[PDB]
Amino acid sequence: PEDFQQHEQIRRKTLKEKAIPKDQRATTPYMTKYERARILGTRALQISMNAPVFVDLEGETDPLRIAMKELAEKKIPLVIRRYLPDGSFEDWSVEELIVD
Amino acid sequence: ISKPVGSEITSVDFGILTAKIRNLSAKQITNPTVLDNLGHPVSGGLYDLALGAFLRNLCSTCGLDEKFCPGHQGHIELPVPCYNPLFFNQLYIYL
Amino acid sequence: ILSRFTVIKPGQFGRSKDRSYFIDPQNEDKILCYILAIIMHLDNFIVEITPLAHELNLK
Amino acid sequence: MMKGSRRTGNNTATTLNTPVVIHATQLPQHVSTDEVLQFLESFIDEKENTNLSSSISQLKRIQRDFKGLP
Amino acid sequence: SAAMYSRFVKSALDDLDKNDSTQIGIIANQVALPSKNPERINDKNLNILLDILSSNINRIESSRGTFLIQSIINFEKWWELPPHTLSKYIYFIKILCSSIPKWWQDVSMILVSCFILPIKQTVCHHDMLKYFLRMIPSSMGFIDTYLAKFFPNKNDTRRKLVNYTSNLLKLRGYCSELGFQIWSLLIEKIISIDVELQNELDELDDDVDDDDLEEVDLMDIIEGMDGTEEYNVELTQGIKELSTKLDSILTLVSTHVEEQVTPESLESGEGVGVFNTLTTLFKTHVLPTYYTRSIQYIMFHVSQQQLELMDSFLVTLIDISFAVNEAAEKKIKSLQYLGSYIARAKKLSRTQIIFVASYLTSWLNRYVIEREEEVDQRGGMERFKHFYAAFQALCYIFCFRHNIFRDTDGNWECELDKFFQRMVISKFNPLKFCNENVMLMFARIAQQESVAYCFSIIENNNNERTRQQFIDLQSYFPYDPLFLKNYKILMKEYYIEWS
Amino acid sequence: DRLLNSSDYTQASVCRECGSILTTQQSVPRIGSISTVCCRRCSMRFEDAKKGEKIFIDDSQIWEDGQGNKFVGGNETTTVAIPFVLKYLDSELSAMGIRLRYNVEPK
Amino acid sequence: TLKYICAECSSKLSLSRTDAVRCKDCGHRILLKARTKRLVQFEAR
Amino acid sequence: MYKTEKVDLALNRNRGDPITQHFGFGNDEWPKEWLEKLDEDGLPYIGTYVEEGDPICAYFDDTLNKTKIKTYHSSEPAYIEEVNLIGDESNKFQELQTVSIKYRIRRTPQIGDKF
Amino acid sequence: TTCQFLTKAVLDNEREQLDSPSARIVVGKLNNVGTGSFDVLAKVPNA
Amino acid sequence: TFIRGPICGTDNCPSRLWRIIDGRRTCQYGHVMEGDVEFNDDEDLGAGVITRRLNLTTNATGSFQSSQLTNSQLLQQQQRQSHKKFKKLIGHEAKLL
Amino acid sequence: NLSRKLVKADSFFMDVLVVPPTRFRLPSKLGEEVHENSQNQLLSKVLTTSLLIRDLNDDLSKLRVIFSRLMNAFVTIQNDVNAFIDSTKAQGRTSGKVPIPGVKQALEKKEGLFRKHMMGKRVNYAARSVISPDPNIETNEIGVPPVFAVKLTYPEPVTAYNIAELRQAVINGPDKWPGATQIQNEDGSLVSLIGMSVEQRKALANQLLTPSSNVSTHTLNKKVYRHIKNRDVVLMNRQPTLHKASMMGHKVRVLPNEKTLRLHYANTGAYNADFDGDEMNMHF
Amino acid sequence: NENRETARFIKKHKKQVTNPIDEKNGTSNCIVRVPIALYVSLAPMYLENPLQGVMKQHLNPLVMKYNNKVGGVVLGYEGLKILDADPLDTSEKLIKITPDTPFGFTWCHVNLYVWQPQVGDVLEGYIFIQSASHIGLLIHDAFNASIKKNNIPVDWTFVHNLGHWVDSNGEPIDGKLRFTVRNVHTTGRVVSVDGTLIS
Ligand SMILES: [Zn+2]
Ligand SMILES: [Zn+2]
Ligand SMILES: [Zn+2]
Ligand SMILES: [Zn+2]
């Protein structure tokens, strides 16, 4: 009980030291063609499990063509966590990235 | 995709099993012949039914059939401690 | 007699409630091994074969 | 056999039904009858604004227990 | 003998002092015989056995003394004992499962599995089982899982299905805390039998002069069966093999729900709770099915018993088919459901038929404000599916209810001779897009009431004219003439016919 | 997809304490219980109950096998997603005397 | 009347059970099965 | 494309092992509709169209008292061309246990054939 | 020379960090090159 | 087409099963048996050495079901001496004959 | 070393062996003859020589020449456990055509384990056939034959937008091409549609959105394994895969009247393929 | 050697907080509040309402059932709080979606009120039956208990009529009975408290 409380406290401190804040982040402001191919993959994989959809789907039965419609309207509620190779990371919402 | 996994493996440690593999397996194997007449697996043999279900018989360890038993490990008691041939060059240096 | 000379079928069913055996041909000598052992002893090791073979109704 | 499939349904503990790990984060600190009765008055009221009805029916006996009398 | 074995089973009970467990399995193997062998324990030797096990319980709770406790619970046909033993065997289970609240894991597995037996056989099963749902309170949970684990198949015999649901409805009336998980288990496992009958439906069944078969008429020998039983498939599922199942199961539900609704329970009792656990079960289970006759008759029967219920069902049904929060195509089947409930339910007053026709015109009176000016914009003729299914839901009323709206003064109710004139001649032509036979019959009966002057506009369709799933929701009427002849007898007082 | 999900995707049982796949076992239950998942080399046999007044067992740590024994402990197992050949690799490495300790993150 | 054909002397041969598979004019062991009047259908394509 | 198959039964005995499984059908049991593909001796009518799963011979064994068949264990539809009854040379009194059966898989020039 | 390197790793008591793509296909972990070089996190609205 | 097997789950019926996708033995009514396999083993006499030849039939993919005695061998050892007729055992009925 | 263990010399020797589970030591079979496994012949011979040294362990309890067979037993109790793990680390008897492989020979080759069944697995949902040309399909397309189009399936979870198309797939069933082969219930139980008739499919397509009674699986929804369609995609593969453009991703375009995979000429320089009888692998 | 060997085994089995006898009533207090942490799986249908999803999937099937980790019967929960994966409180938290599946796993804190009976404690409950072998009871109208014969005092006799009871003074005992707790049994899906009457 004390050995877990002093263990969660380490873990939330380690992950606090690795979070780069939003003003210090210095990676590319574009969506890097793998982020695009996984956002559309993960969003289409959530839509097919009856997640709430934020677009007027006009009879589209492919889940992947629905998620390509939400990426065009910046309605996807996902966050890219870009890892730097020490383990530290930067959070980028899909709304603020730039689509090629 | 409707059966998610929670816990996940992130690092693998190599080691050496000690003398107390005997603790994880009280199903020693003595009889070298694997079957007898009437097609049955003989007890204390290499196809013993405490190593996993076999020949339409339930497992003596899991209590489960052939489709759902993971299978289990037994051990052969060496009477004299032979050396492991992987680590033989790395004891002949220390010798 | 049937426990020493013959064969009861394996498992746990046909041995305690209701017995089930089969007269195998490999124990048709062994039953007659001790039938003829008593008759030999009744005449003090002088066996009269042909009147016994009409009595035992065999060849 | 069939019972090897019934115990897959008798267990029925997936990672959707059950949490992966549970850890107590502090020590269990005891409460008073004035705090149990204050909680059960609020826990039953929250769920009654499915499942859980077979459970709440066992809590109302305990709510009847700490103050009332059969 | 009977005084001699009393010192035998006490001597077998003495396996705790020196811990040998000698005569445990010998007694336990004689009590584990079937009813087809007269060599089992009899009514005299069992009371020798049972009363020693009821006078002490400490000298049985061993891991080796556990074995005979199985065969006393697995003592089959125990509901057929004489009352010197039956009223004493029940007393043993009531002390085993209360001294040790661990065998109700395994005793309630038996009592629920023995719900194949009828009501006249399970009078003593439930009266034990009602006792432990109050004495063992933490058994509301895992007995719910037993009632789904032991419900029979879709295609077992009828004796297992009609008498499980008969014993299951018995368990509802004495355990209202379960309640919802009773009806969810029924209605979902009636759809399995139900939906396999409309696609089969071609010809009327033979009305055989024998309606019921027979009255009450009353070893393992296992081999190594692993080979073939090939080319003996007989996979030819019958007509009456599922029509008579849907008769006897679903008549029995309507019988049990008619008993449990009454105006004296709708005032301060639990008869409201029977209704709401079917209404939420209606809008979640049956309403998203496709092509389902013969299960919306359950809500049809129940929402016809009292007038307050139809004041809490029709207002529920309008809130489905007109809310924006609902789905794109749940707002058409429910309009298709609304038109066929008003036009076939008998026990309603005028003030409820009017208030449907009040809103079903007032929604169409609001329709002139916005959704009639989008005809000129470039789009398909099927953006307004919500409109055509609403107009079908009102023209199917007049084809059946055309004499309720006749008043004594000689008018109509909010211009019934005038409002349909404007809606038909308008800029949508609903004489074409809706189902034909529901619309061909509206004009003919309005021709006999001198309202429709639009029989060339019907002929102006051969040159005036996602379409298949718009036909298919309109050729579906939830309250068609039923095919089940045993269950129609219940509904003949409740169901308006064609005429 | 190609080298895991469409070839040999199996969900195995891994003890979080010793980190092993092969030495887990679904327990033969006592008749009034449910067959749970238990590890074998973390498990101590129930006769080892050697002796704050006493150190008695919480009655849900004890499980049995089909031979008939009893074992205290051996819980704290979880389910991970491995290829099945990893389960066969670990049996080929035990036969050389080599164990693979898996470190599984939710602890 | 079911028949076979000897592979050597081409003599038609009904072969009952509990008979050795031999010709009965010569003694030839290999013995080939004839075809009888039986319907099979084809498309002429 | 002609293609043969050796339906043998004597592969699973010893020198003194008696004849376990015969040819032809049995009695006191009736798996029907094998008589469309097969003749009274448990061998196919030659000239018969077959597909996968179709019976190719019927052998009645005596350690089951059951008329078992074995199926056409290939997925292209053939025609039975020849059925040869192989006799026995080691003695003069055993029943038939080897049948070599020849198929005729017709092969028109489909798309994808090298010329 | 699989068991030659295995000898050098077992004597080392070497923790494999499971980061190379030849070690992630063995344990069945997602590869860290390309679309496995980041994480997708979903943003839930309610507290 | 089917083969005899155990009873299917889901409270199906006493059923007999049938492999359909070569590894999923369904029941008669189409319920795939959960956790079924149909194993095999690969060969591309010769091509290696022969340990022994223990004779099993192995139609249950691993486990074997046939090739055992004292089940129908019970009625096989006592039938052959009573199957053939004309035994020349005929002691007094032959005078009648 | 955070666990502060001890390096002990017993770790170099072998006190016990461990027997692998029976599933990993099943008997072999070829044709109609079952044989004993490789891992029992090397592993019984340790256990007979363990027995034979206990047979001779009684020959000092009642008590030269017997120590010339005792010391002979220690060399061959070593040479059997040596031949259990390796097989090149033994001596053997004769030319036994490269004798019985140990547990190192199962790992170290091109074949074996670590390169044949970890880097090189065989896959489900894959088809190969001879390729044929087509200039009428697109450049980013493949022509799937109708033979492959009624076999390869995709698990499509049924939701409120694909219910109109997945009902039509179950009605067509696993023979007519825009169809489906089996459905998956919310408890994971599969229901195969192959033996069923046109009535057991229509009366099971109508139950794709019916919620189950169970509350543990109230999240999930059914999965209809529809056939491959023109909106599906496919990895295609020419077999010597010397660079990453030899394994590209095509869009399916299902054709009638064929048995050959069918390709466009823009792709045939990428895969280094020509239409002389080459086969390509189609992964789905 | 063994002084710091079994300490990692004995302290695995010693329960943490002992139940006190309180308010000069003699009865112990077994309802306790423990804060815990979970690792649960939010599903995509509850991706808009995350707190309803963690309650309905993982917390509601946990009430009135014995949990091994808290060591008791979980009554209810209070103060569910999802830990954000963004160490920036706020409404727009975010969880981490697994790569293979569309689900998300996350940490949560919650306070569980559990019922914690232990040995040597005092529990008073109604007697619901009593027979010629035991005294059967409830506890708090929900929890089954029993007192068997070998822990019934010798000065108490079972008068027979079902049957009433005779104490050491010739009195029928009522439903409400005070007794001292023996081994609490767990292994079923029913929590059983075996008890004693002797001191
Ligand atoms: Zn097992
Ligand atoms: Zn472990
Ligand atoms: Zn001839
Ligand atoms: Zn089934």
PDB file of C-alpha atoms in Angstrom, chain A residues 1-2 4-5 8, chain D residues 23-27:
ATOM      1  CA  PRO A   1       0.000   0.000   0.000  1.00  0.00           C
ATOM      2  CA  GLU A   2       2.857   2.392   0.736  1.00  0.00           C
ATOM      3  CA  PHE A   4       2.430   1.333  -4.529  1.00  0.00           C
ATOM      4  CA  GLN A   5       1.772   4.924  -3.466  1.00  0.00           C
ATOM      5  CA  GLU A   8       2.679   5.634  -8.791  1.00  0.00           C
TER       6      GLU A   8
ATOM      7  CA  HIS D  23      -4.066  -1.570  -6.057  1.00  0.00           C
ATOM      8  CA  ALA D  24      -4.994   0.046  -2.775  1.00  0.00           C
ATOM      9  CA  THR D  25      -3.252   3.401  -2.762  1.00  0.00           C
ATOM     10  CA  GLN D  26      -3.481   4.160   0.982  1.00  0.00           C
ATOM     11  CA  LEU D  27      -4.473   2.341   4.103  1.00  0.00           C
TER      12      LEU D  27
END
